């Protein structure tokens, strides 16, 4: 059976990067020749496995980390790369084996007037452990004062919307990322 690389790519909706999906792909034939031989995916360069040898290997567990991010902030989906998404929203392990892909989604994720659905963790008290997700709502404490209450000065909600307006440039355009991970 051909395992679902179709509702992790041609999905109606990818979730945000602060709460990213984890669809375990198992017990199939995973054909990556339909996945590499397509001009849509802009950022199908990858780590640990050469991309042309993916259909020659059998893996133990295959994941598929569906999310959508800003156009610039896609170099931060990389092993050892540090940034704001890479620190606080989605961290790859330094020994990452797998293949991250990405493509531009102005037709889908950027409606006229904006698409404020996709939000990212601007703040957290600590850097991420790799492959850790944190869906929290506690107000971040920045200054010396422990407010622990309403969002005051030096007291921020950690999330903030991307604001995917259709006029926005490819630096801010919604890039749709799937991060495969293997054994």
């Amino acid at each position, epitope marked *: 059976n051909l395992c679902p690389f179709g509702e992790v790519f041609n999905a109606t909706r990818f979730a945000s990067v602060y709460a990213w999906n984890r669809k375990r792909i198992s017990n199939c034939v995973a054909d990556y020749s339909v996945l590499y031989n397509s*001009a849509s995916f*802009s950022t199908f360069k990858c780590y640990g496995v050469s991309p042309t040898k993916l259909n020659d290997l059998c893996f133990t567990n295959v994941y598929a980390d569906s999310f959508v991010i800003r*156009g*610039d*902030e*896609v*170099r*931060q989906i990389a092993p050892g790369q540090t*940034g704001k998404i890479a620190d606080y929203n989605y961290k790859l392990p330094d020994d990452f084996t797998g293949c991250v892909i990405a493509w*531009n989604s*102005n037709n889908l994720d950027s409606k*006229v007037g904006g698409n404020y659905n996709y939000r990212y963790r601007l703040f957290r008290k600590s850097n991420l452990k790799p492959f850790e997700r944190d869906i929290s709502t506690e107000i971040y404490q920045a200054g010396s004062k422990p407010c622990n209450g309403v969002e005051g000065f030096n007291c921020y909600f950690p999330l903030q919307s991307y*604001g995917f*307006q*259709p*006029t*926005n*440039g*490819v*630096g*801010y*355009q919604p890039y749709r990322v799937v991060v495969l991970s293997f054994e």
Partner: antibody
Amino acid sequence: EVHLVESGGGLVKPGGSLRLSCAASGFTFSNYAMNWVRQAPGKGLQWVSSITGSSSFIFYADSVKGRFTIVRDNAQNSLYLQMNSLRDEDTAVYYCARERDDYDTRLDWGQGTLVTVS
Amino acid sequence: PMLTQPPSVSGAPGQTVTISCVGSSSNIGAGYEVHWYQQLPGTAPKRLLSGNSDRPSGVPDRFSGSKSGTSASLAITGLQADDEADYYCQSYDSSLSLSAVVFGGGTKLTV
């Protein structure tokens, strides 16, 4: 008060080299994109090169593709453009331009430092 | 220029002149904002418009705008002597592996 000012443009022999810098103030340099764009005298504006805030998107015009390298420094508040191997048509006043989170085609401008090759 | 324009549209004071800017589907027809710039001779360009009426802070309100299909406009009604500069249209072109702001051909405006 958005401040883009350039430095480095001057008369070079054709086939020579240069490096126009572009200082920045009054905004977050690491957030917006950055453009290098020139105007030859008696000519309109021709787009030359663009870089973005993470510099993960670097693009060049077809006439200068493989000839130039736009380099930015996200912490120094400075944007550079490595000028190499100049042809005849690069006689222009080179402007520094920044995009904005609102539209990212909205551009601010620099006063322009001239480059002439002959 | 990847956009197009008439070479020079100009007229008498007290008139309206429509400075068009027509381009492809990727630059205007994909909904990107169309900006108009005032380049005085010997001066860096200074923007004066965005889409339909999004003027910047500190310009007279004669410069209105519009969008139509794969085109735009810079209808300036009732010109004065201060409106003597070259005018450039703009968009953003996100064709694959280009991702560039695009400028117009250049329209001179005299009184």
